[PDB]
Design a protein around this ligand. Structure first.
Ligand SMILES: [Zn+2]
Length: 60
DNA sequence: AGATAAAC
DNA sequence: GTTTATCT
């Protein structure tokens, strides 16, 4: 039940992987990934109503 | 969960 | 070049 777990980095409640930060900040995996890229705070301008999805990667 | 690779 | 979701 992650209803209420608002991503402390982008306020998104729908996430592909709830990255529970050790400090106690539930941040949607997307924030944890891009954060590792530039190591800065993500503006939720790229957020969306439901979890984004596409042609799932074919089983390799 | 974390890692991988894909797709735009 | 760049970013995230689904994969395992
Ligand atoms: Zn987030």
């Amino acid at each position: 039940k992650r209803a209420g777990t608002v991503c402390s980095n982008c306020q998104t409640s729908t996430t592909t992987l709830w990255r529970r930060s050790p400090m106690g900040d539930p941040v949607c995996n997307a924030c944890g990934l891009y954060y590792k890229l530039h190591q800065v705070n993500r503006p939720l301008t790229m957020r969306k109503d439901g979890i984004q999805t596409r042609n799932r990667k074919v089983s390799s």
